[PDB]
Design an enzyme around this catalytic site. Structure first.
Site, short mmCIF file in Angstrom:
data_model
loop_
_atom_site.label_atom_id
_atom_site.label_comp_id
_atom_site.label_asym_id
_atom_site.label_seq_id
_atom_site.Cartn_x
_atom_site.Cartn_y
_atom_site.Cartn_z
N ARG A 25 17.90 14.27 7.95
CA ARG A 25 16.73 13.59 8.46
C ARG A 25 16.69 12.11 8.98
O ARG A 25 16.14 11.61 9.61
CB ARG A 25 15.65 13.90 7.79
CG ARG A 25 15.24 15.46 6.98
CD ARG A 25 14.04 15.72 6.23
NE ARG A 25 13.01 14.92 7.15
CZ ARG A 25 11.58 14.95 7.19
NH1 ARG A 25 10.75 15.55 5.99
NH2 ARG A 25 11.16 14.25 8.06
N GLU A 62 14.06 16.95 -17.11
CA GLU A 62 13.42 17.28 -15.78
C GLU A 62 12.95 18.48 -15.96
O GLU A 62 12.05 19.00 -15.44
CB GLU A 62 14.41 17.40 -14.53
CG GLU A 62 13.64 17.48 -13.12
CD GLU A 62 14.40 17.97 -11.97
OE1 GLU A 62 15.03 18.80 -11.96
OE2 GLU A 62 14.01 17.15 -10.74
N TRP A 84 13.25 11.09 -9.72
CA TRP A 84 12.26 11.39 -8.97
C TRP A 84 11.22 10.00 -8.65
O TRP A 84 10.62 9.95 -7.58
CB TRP A 84 10.95 12.44 -9.70
CG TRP A 84 11.23 13.78 -9.37
CD1 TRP A 84 12.28 14.82 -9.75
CD2 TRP A 84 10.94 14.59 -7.96
NE1 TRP A 84 12.27 15.84 -9.47
CE2 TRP A 84 11.58 15.78 -8.04
CE3 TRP A 84 10.29 14.12 -6.83
CZ2 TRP A 84 11.38 16.84 -6.90
CZ3 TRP A 84 9.99 15.16 -5.77
CH2 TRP A 84 10.88 16.36 -5.83
N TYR A 110 7.70 21.48 -7.88
CA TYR A 110 8.08 22.50 -8.52
C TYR A 110 7.00 22.76 -9.34
O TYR A 110 6.32 24.05 -9.30
CB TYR A 110 9.51 22.14 -9.32
CG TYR A 110 10.29 22.08 -8.39
CD1 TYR A 110 10.53 23.10 -7.25
CD2 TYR A 110 11.06 21.06 -8.08
CE1 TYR A 110 11.39 22.78 -6.22
CE2 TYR A 110 11.94 20.84 -7.09
CZ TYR A 110 12.03 21.82 -6.05
OH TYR A 110 13.07 21.74 -5.13
N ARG A 150 12.68 45.07 -9.85
CA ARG A 150 13.76 44.53 -8.98
C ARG A 150 13.09 43.80 -8.06
O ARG A 150 13.26 43.21 -7.13
CB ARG A 150 14.35 46.18 -8.39
CG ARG A 150 15.08 46.73 -7.02
CD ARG A 150 14.96 48.43 -6.84
NE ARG A 150 16.29 49.08 -7.07
CZ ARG A 150 16.87 48.62 -8.46
NH1 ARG A 150 16.31 48.37 -9.63
NH2 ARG A 150 18.44 49.16 -8.86
N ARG A 151 11.82 43.40 -8.74
CA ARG A 151 11.25 41.88 -7.92
C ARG A 151 10.44 40.91 -8.94
O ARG A 151 9.68 40.19 -8.49
CB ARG A 151 10.17 42.21 -7.00
CG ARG A 151 8.87 43.07 -7.32
CD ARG A 151 9.11 44.39 -7.41
NE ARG A 151 7.95 45.28 -7.30
CZ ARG A 151 7.52 45.84 -6.35
NH1 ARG A 151 8.26 45.68 -5.18
NH2 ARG A 151 6.36 46.54 -6.45
N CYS A 170 14.61 22.71 -2.67
CA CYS A 170 15.68 23.19 -2.12
C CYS A 170 15.95 24.11 -2.90
O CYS A 170 17.18 24.91 -2.79
CB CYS A 170 16.68 22.46 -1.57
SG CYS A 170 16.76 20.80 -2.33
N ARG A 190 17.95 25.85 -0.32
CA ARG A 190 18.19 25.82 1.41
C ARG A 190 19.42 24.81 1.50
O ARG A 190 19.87 24.83 2.71
CB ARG A 190 16.78 25.23 1.73
CG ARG A 190 16.29 24.36 1.38
CD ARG A 190 15.28 24.19 1.88
NE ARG A 190 14.62 22.65 1.47
CZ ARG A 190 15.11 21.54 1.95
NH1 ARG A 190 16.03 21.32 2.97
NH2 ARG A 190 14.50 20.36 1.54
N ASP A 193 23.48 19.34 -1.35
CA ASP A 193 24.62 18.24 -1.36
C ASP A 193 25.56 18.47 -2.24
O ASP A 193 25.54 17.74 -3.54
CB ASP A 193 23.83 17.16 -2.20
CG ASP A 193 24.67 15.85 -2.09
OD1 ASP A 193 25.71 15.86 -1.89
OD2 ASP A 193 23.82 14.86 -2.51
N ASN A 201 22.12 21.04 -10.07
CA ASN A 201 21.27 22.15 -9.90
C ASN A 201 21.89 23.46 -10.98
O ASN A 201 21.08 24.12 -11.57
CB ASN A 201 21.14 22.81 -8.72
CG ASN A 201 20.36 21.36 -7.42
OD1 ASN A 201 21.37 20.89 -7.03
ND2 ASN A 201 19.07 21.20 -7.75
N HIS A 231 26.36 20.81 2.44
CA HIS A 231 27.11 19.76 2.74
C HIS A 231 27.84 18.71 2.19
O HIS A 231 26.89 18.42 1.26
CB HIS A 231 26.20 18.98 3.61
CG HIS A 231 24.64 18.73 2.91
ND1 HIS A 231 24.02 19.64 2.95
CD2 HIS A 231 24.37 17.56 2.43
CE1 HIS A 231 22.74 19.29 2.41
NE2 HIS A 231 23.10 17.96 1.90
N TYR A 233 28.24 14.49 2.05
CA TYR A 233 27.84 13.34 2.92
C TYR A 233 29.20 12.68 3.26
O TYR A 233 30.26 12.73 2.52
CB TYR A 233 27.15 12.25 2.03
CG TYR A 233 25.44 12.72 2.21
CD1 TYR A 233 24.85 12.00 3.44
CD2 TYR A 233 24.99 13.52 1.50
CE1 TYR A 233 23.54 12.31 3.46
CE2 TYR A 233 23.43 13.95 1.75
CZ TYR A 233 22.80 13.15 2.86
OH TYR A 233 21.43 13.63 3.23
#
Lengths: 283, 281
Positions: A25, A62, A84, A110, A150-151, A170, A190, A193, A201, A231, A233
């Site tokens: 962005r 966190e 944060w 979150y 299964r949900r 994300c 989503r 990095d 994560n 991605h 950087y």
């Protein structure tokens, strides 16, 4: 019996060898690939990364942070963590043209989508008890009552709310799953990095999962990591190139200290990470 | 190249010799595997599976129905297709206590949420216009304008609308991603029937994509399929072991025929499948 951290190292051979350029962005370009999944066994290793230190304390603290539902980047630096903090600053607030909402208030993120999902957001201190769905509970409760459900899915996606967070998440989504009293997690991030965030994560959701196997007294299964925009950087090509050269070490074991049975009960001491020997330092 | 149905043939080959036995909401068995992903090329092929015929009208009429944000299912029959039928035909409603309802009425299912996120669902008769969040279109917005965005997500999995719903969505969410001009799409799928789900839900999404690339002047890139509970019914095993013996051929091709300004302007008459070879049998 191949090391799970090869999965990640391998993903990075991929994005280096095949990524295409793509700006974020803010215009900085990266090398991006779209669509990916590695699987980590939690059969009680803990996939904290070896070819480089991840910030445990950070993950940990966190989480207790979202776990408690919190929305004050402030509530969190009180506990010595400024990852944060940065998006709670007057300045940054203001950018987004929330010039009212007082220092630290991350909007609904979150932790509030984690326990007041659909509750109207007032501010980071307007008490929210019983309000909105508490998807953290329902995941638990379902696990304990039918585990073949299964949900059993927790989402942090709120469009109604997004136009409105310090940022959108994300971790859009994670689902759990259960078979032979083994519990697994799968996560849909989503944007990833890999240089500097991805390994966190995995920690972060490997953690969550352990916590949940605990409270529900299941055993830990696979963590599955799923990405969309994976991605690196460009600054990082370098150092990763070096790092992609390190040979993984054993993953550590993660102990829990204190049979504990509401989720919300957990406390920074309750775990203790054992035998983490990350290779050193890179640049 | 190395063919794509192999993907899926893989995924199964996997489960059926690696999945654990796990029962569903009506205690039927399932060899079952949790978590996969497969990548399907959309580059001048469209990947309708071959080794097994797919109901294509079925797929091509289902999305259009979605597109228009419909929730009464008899509308879908209407247009020649019976998938979502006994799901709003009478008995299946109060088995879930749905009574002060009318019939063919599925509640705030998919169509509803693509075009009206965070909007009070009442009944299926109701003009919905103006209220909610056209997650869908916004997505077309956010591409046209500006494709770098890493946030195009069309999330269906609304937890508030979750008592209220006929079926819970199998398709909780997808992301598009465009780079260098091509469009891609990843569907995250809660749970998926390797038997008789998947062939279909792939299609549906693919074709979804050809629709946006077309509308947005971009070209289709990749459809990446992501599964959560992937499973085979113990039922389907012996037959599958058979299509498991079948070698699949090139994909068909899919040429949109008119030239379409907005998404809601599509018409079925608008899609020719091409040099399309489907087996079996």
């Amino acid at each position: 019996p191949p090391h799970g951290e090869l999965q990640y190292l391998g993903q990075i051979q991929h994005i280096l060898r095949c990524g295409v350029r793509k700006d974020d962005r803010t215009g900085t370009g990266t090398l991006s690939v779209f669509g990916m999944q590695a699987r980590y066994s939690l059969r009680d290793e803990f996939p904290l990364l070896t070819t480089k230190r991840v910030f445990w304390k950070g993950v940990l603290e966190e989480l207790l942070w979202f776990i408690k539902g919190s929305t004050n980047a402030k509530e969190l630096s009180s506990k010595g963590v400024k990852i944060w903090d940065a998006n709670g600053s007057r300045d940054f607030l203001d950018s987004l043209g929330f010039s009212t909402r007082e220092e630290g208030d991350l909007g609904p993120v979150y932790g509030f989508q984690w326990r007041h999902f659909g509750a109207e957001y007032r501010d980071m201190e307007s008490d929210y008890s019983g309000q909105g769905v508490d998807q953290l509970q329902r995941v638990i409760d379902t696990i304990k009552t039918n585990p073949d459900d299964r949900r059993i899915i927790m989402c942090a996606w709120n469009p109604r709310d997004l136009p409105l967070m310090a940022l959108p998440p994300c971790h859009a989504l994670c689902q759990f799953y259960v078979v032979n009293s083994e519990l697994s997690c799968q996560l849909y991030q989503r944007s990833g990095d890999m240089g500097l965030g991805v390994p966190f994560n995995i920690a972060s959701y490997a953690l969550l999962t352990y916590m949940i196997a605990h409270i529900t007294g299941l055993k830990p299964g696979d963590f599955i990591h799923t990405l969309g925009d994976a991605h690196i950087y460009l600054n990082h090509i370098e150092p990763l190139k070096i790092q992609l050269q390190r040979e993984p070490r054993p993953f550590p074991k993660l102990r829990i200290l204190r049979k504990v049975e509401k989720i919300d009960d957990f406390k920074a001491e309750d775990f203790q990470i054992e035998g983490y020997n990350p290779h050193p330092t890179i640049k």
